[PDB]
Amino acid sequence: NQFNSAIGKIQDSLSSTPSALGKLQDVVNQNAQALNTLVKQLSSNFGAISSVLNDILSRLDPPEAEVQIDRLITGRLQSLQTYVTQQLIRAAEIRASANLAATKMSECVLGQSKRVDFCGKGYHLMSFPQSAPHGVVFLHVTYIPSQEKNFTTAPAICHDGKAHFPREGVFVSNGTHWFITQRNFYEPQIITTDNTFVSGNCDVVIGIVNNTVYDP
Amino acid sequence: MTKTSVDCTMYICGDSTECSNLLLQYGSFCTQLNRALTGIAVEQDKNTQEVFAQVKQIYKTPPIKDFGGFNFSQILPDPSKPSKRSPIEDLLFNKVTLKQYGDCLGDIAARDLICAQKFNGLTVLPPLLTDEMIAQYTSALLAGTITSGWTFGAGPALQIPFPMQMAYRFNGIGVTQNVLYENQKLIANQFNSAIGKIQDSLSSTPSALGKLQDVVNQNAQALNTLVKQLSSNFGAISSVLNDILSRLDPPEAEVQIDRLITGRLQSLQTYVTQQLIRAAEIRASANLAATKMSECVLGQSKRVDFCGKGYHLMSFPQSAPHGVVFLHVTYIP
Amino acid sequence: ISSVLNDILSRLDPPEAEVQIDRLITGRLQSLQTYVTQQLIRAAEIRAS
Amino acid sequence: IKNKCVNFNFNGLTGTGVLTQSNKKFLPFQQFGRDIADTTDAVRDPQTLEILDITPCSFGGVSVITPGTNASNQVAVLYQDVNCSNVFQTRAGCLIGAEHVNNSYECDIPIGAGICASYQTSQSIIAYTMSLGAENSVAYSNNSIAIPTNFTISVTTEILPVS
Ligand SMILES: *[C@@H]1O[C@H](CO)[C@@H](O[C@@H]2O[C@H](CO)[C@@H](O)[C@H](O)[C@H]2NC(C)=O)[C@H](O)[C@H]1NC(C)=O
Ligand SMILES: *[C@@H]1O[C@H](CO)[C@@H](O)[C@H](O)[C@H]1NC(C)=O
Ligand SMILES: *[C@@H]1O[C@H](CO)[C@@H](O)[C@H](O)[C@H]1NC(C)=O
Ligand SMILES: *[C@@H]1O[C@H](CO)[C@@H](O)[C@H](O)[C@H]1NC(C)=O
Ligand SMILES: *[C@@H]1O[C@H](CO)[C@@H](O)[C@H](O)[C@H]1NC(C)=O
Ligand SMILES: *[C@@H]1O[C@H](CO)[C@@H](O)[C@H](O)[C@H]1NC(C)=O
Ligand SMILES: *[C@@H]1O[C@H](CO)[C@@H](O)[C@H](O)[C@H]1NC(C)=O
Ligand SMILES: *[C@@H]1O[C@H](CO)[C@@H](O)[C@H](O)[C@H]1NC(C)=O
Numbered sequence: 001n002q003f004n005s006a007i008g009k010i011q012d013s014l015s016s017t018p019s020a021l022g023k024l025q026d027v028v029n030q031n032a033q034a035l036n037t038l039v040k041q042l043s044s045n046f047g048a049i050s051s052v053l054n055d056i057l058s059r060l061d062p063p064e065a066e067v068q069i070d071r072l073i074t075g076r077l078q079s080l081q082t083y084v085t086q087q088l089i090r091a092a093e094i095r096a097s098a099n100l101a102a103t104k105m106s107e108c109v110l111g112q113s114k115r116v117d118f119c120g121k122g123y124h125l126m127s128f129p130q131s132a133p134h135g136v137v138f139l140h141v142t143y144i145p146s147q148e149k150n151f152t153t154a155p156a157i158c159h160d161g162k163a164h165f166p167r168e169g170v171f172v173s174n175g176t177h178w179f180i181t182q183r184n185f186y187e188p189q190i191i192t193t194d195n196t197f198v199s200g201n202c203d204v205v206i207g208i209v210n211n212t213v214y215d216p
Numbered sequence: 217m218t219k220t221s222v223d224c225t226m227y228i229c230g231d232s233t234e235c236s237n238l239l240l241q242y243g244s245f246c247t248q249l250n251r252a253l254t255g256i257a258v259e260q261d262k263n264t265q266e267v268f269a270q271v272k273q274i275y276k277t278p279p280i281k282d283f284g285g286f287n288f289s290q291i292l293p294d295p296s297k298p299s300k301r302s303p304i305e306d307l308l309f310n311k312v313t314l315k316q317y318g319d320c321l322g323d324i325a326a327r328d329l330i331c332a333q334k335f336n337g338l339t340v341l342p343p344l345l346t347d348e349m350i351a352q353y354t355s356a357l358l359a360g361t362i363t364s365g366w367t368f369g370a371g372p373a374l375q376i377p378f379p380m381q382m383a384y385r386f387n388g389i390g391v392t393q394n395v396l397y398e399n400q401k402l403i404a405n406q407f408n409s410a411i412g413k414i415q416d417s418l419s420s421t422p423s424a425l426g427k428l429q430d431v432v433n434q435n436a437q438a439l440n441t442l443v444k445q446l447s448s449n450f451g452a453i454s455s456v457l458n459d460i461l462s463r464l465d466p467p468e469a470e471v472q473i474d475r476l477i478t479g480r481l482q483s484l485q486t487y488v489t490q491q492l493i494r495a496a497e498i499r500a501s502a503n504l505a506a507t508k509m510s511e512c513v514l515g516q517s518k519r520v521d522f523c524g525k526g527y528h529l530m531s532f533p534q535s536a537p538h539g540v541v542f543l544h545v546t547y548i549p
Numbered sequence: 550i551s552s553v554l555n556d557i558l559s560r561l562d563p564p565e566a567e568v569q570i571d572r573l574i575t576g577r578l579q580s581l582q583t584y585v586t587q588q589l590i591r592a593a594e595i596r597a598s
Numbered sequence: 599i600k601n602k603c604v605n606f607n608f609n610g611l612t613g614t615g616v617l618t619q620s621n622k623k624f625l626p627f628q629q630f631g632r633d634i635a636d637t638t639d640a641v642r643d644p645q646t647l648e649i650l651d652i653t654p655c656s657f658g659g660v661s662v663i664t665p666g667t668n669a670s671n672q673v674a675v676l677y678q679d680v681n682c683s684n685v686f687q688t689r690a691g692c693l694i695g696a697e698h699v700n701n702s703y704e705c706d707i708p709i710g711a712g713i714c715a716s717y718q719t720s721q722s723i724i725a726y727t728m729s730l731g732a733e734n735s736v737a738y739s740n741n742s743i744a745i746p747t748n749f750t751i752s753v754t755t756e757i758l759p760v761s
Pocket of ligand 6: 646
């Protein structure tokens with residue numbers, strides 16, 4: 001039920017707020033604006049008497065006109081060169097982004113990742129891909145703990161000399177008894193010969209307490 | 217890196233009314249240049265966001281500071297001074313080296329470079345996040361790392377004593393916790409001695425922070441070269457607009473002014489392209505730094521040779537001018 | 550008027566040859582700058598690899 | 599005329615700028631002195647022989663804070679490189695047209711060294727210090743552990759351009 005409610009709320013939140021898919025829209029706007037600027041830079045006359053070839057060809061003979069034509073040619077070549085350079089830089093940036101997307105598809109979608117803050121905030125559970133114009137959208141499903149509680153703890157336990165260390169988990173106490181639990185979810189359990197292992201005497205561990213182990 | 221802005225009319229024409237009228241034909245070019253540089257500047261303030269704004273709440277360090285035998289009185293801020301810094305942070309800040317109209321008007325005998333490049337339309341913008349806020353972010357990160365461990369990176373922070381966290385980390389690297397629990401004092405002494413000697417080594421070497429100095433030197437040299445390139449006449453009779461406007465009628469001065477305009481425009485274009493390339497490089501470096509902060513500070517990483525040489529234990533962040541410094545703690549057989 | 554400096558220096562006096570020499574200088578400087586920029590971009594890609 | 603931005607013509611050299619007095623020493627065969635970027639900065643005087651310096655009278659940086667056209671037409675102005683009704687002094691320069699407050703909110707329009715501006719209610723433009731977030735302090739000890747009892751499953755979206 002939590003998963004279903006989460007996906008429904010994600011759908012509603014995407015529907016409600018237009019200002020969500022900023023990056024792809026920015027890419028499209030950048031491209032369109034670049035071409036529009038290239039189109040409208042034709043009106044400039046780079047030192048020539050006019051910005052129209054027809055006027056120069058109509059008012060001047062060839063030997064007086066090649067100079068104006070040459071000035072215009074150099075200006076327009078420079079404009080095209082600038083456009084190409086900007087396109088190359090943007091292509092490099094998009095290549096880096098696509099490499100990151102491919103890595104994320106390889107790791108978060110085809111497996112489970114141990115890296116922190118790579119496939120979502122929290123302990124990663126799984127991921128799902130969705131297409132979009134010129135892009136991809138990853139839905140990350142993760143785990144988050146909450147509703148914490150205080151307890152009293154001690155590193156080891158003295159059991160007549162054989163100090164006991166927890167095989168896995170943490171030693172906790174509610175005030176009268178002692179238990180060994182797992183780190184994330186609270187679930188206490190009684191102590192037996194398992195869950196523990198012995199190494200050394202109870203005269204070197206700083207914080208070891210006196211208790212008993214109900215080994216069968 | 218540094219955020220800069222340029223004014224075309226001041227740089228090219230320089231308060232000349234005969235100029236800035238022939239410049240209109242090229243106007244649609246300059247509106248591009250700034251629209252590039254702005255795109256750089258807004259990105260810079262964004263970069264610092266992915267490195268230090270990982271956490272959302274400012275944590276406060278405890279006042280008791282027992283921590284078994286471990287001693288952190290070189291990383292945590294020292295309250296008995298301004299700026300709320302750390303001695304290591306103080307050394308890092310001091311090691312890296314880096315004005316109203318009346319100031320530049322009175323300082324003529326000594327020819328300041330900053331005034332010279334400000335009189336030609338080149339301006340430097342301040343960063344959004346100040347140094348004190350960066351220090352506060354770092355202090356919160358250290359407090360969360362010390363008291364909560366790796367838990368505060370995913371969900372609410374949970375308290376845990378330091379020796380238990382160290383035992384968990386040894387269990388992570390592949391050695392049983394009983395090894396730590398019975399060798400606490402020697403390990404703590406080794407850690408303290410390592411911190412002391414790393415501070416001493418940082419103090420001893422002057423040329424240790426090469427990269428940040430390289431960045432600031434590159435920016436300063438680029439701006440100075442842009443300023444000095446105004447003395448070149450691109451085929452005209454002179455490099456001074458006033459001489460041309462004083463010795464020639466407008467129809468003859470048109471050609472020389474056009475030549476100068478084209479030369480200065482292409483100089484500005486070259487500068488902008490170089491800045492864009494350097495910004496891309498800095499973006500890559502910042503992304504790497506953000507990933508390192510996410511994986512070596514908020515958790516223990518298993519990647520080989522990623523968070524230091526040897527088996528990884530933990531890492532500590534420190535701020536620096538235009539940069540970050542990671543202190544990696546590693547285990548070696 | 551030509552792509553060879555020798556022809557220009559052989560047919561014209563310095564004051565008139567200066568214009569063509571300037572045009573050639575500007576063109577070749579532009580070519581060199583374009584080459585350098587492309588080299589920088591390729592170097593960035595190689596560094597990433 | 600001195601200490602005023604004027605149009606000047608010295609022996610045919612024309613220009614626009616402010617004249618001031620300096621201590622440069624000129625050899626008898628020198629009349630002009632130019633800067634590194636070939637700009638005439640020092641000039642003698644044909645009458646009352648002396649050395650004077652020329653400095654341009656245009657200098658500074660100006661920014662315009664606006665809420666947008668279809669919100670209002672009120673505007674604030676940020677003057678860098680100056681030390682000044684509503685005037686506020688920041689380390690990034692003087693700010694005119696905005697009201698300084700003591701509260702702390704998020705950032706709408708970045709201004710400079712830790713200062714942000716916003717348009718809020720009658721409406722007005724307010725400048726303040728940006729807030730880093732809430733404040734928290736966990737209680738460290740050597741006997742207390744904190745263990746969660748419940749959990750939750752979260753779904754988050756990440757968007758990446760491809761081509
Ligand atoms: C942590 O180490 C510092 C550095 O040695 C200790 O500060 C020293 O304290 C002694 C006695 O108070 C002084 O004589 C030294 O001059 C101090 N050194 C410095 C560099 O200031 C500090 O006491 C240690 N703290 C703990 C809890 O061990
Ligand atoms: C745990 O103890 C601290 C300090 O006594 C207290 O602030 C906190 O609220 C306690 N936790 C719970 C869940 O009550
Ligand atoms: C602690 O847990 C034990 C386990 O059953 C229980 O008997 C005891 O009443 C608990 N004490 C408190 C104070 O909750
Ligand atoms: C925890 O710290 C207090 C403060 O000095 C100390 O008295 C106590 O012995 C410590 N706990 C253990 C298990 O040593
Ligand atoms: C644990 O027991 C030993 C001997 O049985 C005794 O010497 C020691 O004081 C006890 N510790 C505590 C905390 O009661
Ligand atoms: C030049 O003549 C004018 C006459 O009005 C006089 O005021 C000025 O002092 C003279 N200058 C010199 C250098 O003699
Ligand atoms: C804000 O704080 C300053 C300094 O504490 C104080 O003088 C002023 O009255 C406060 N209120 C306003 C509206 O500025
Ligand atoms: C855990 O949370 C769920 C929903 O948030 C709730 O139904 C349930 O009662 C909670 N259980 C505990 C032990 O907090």
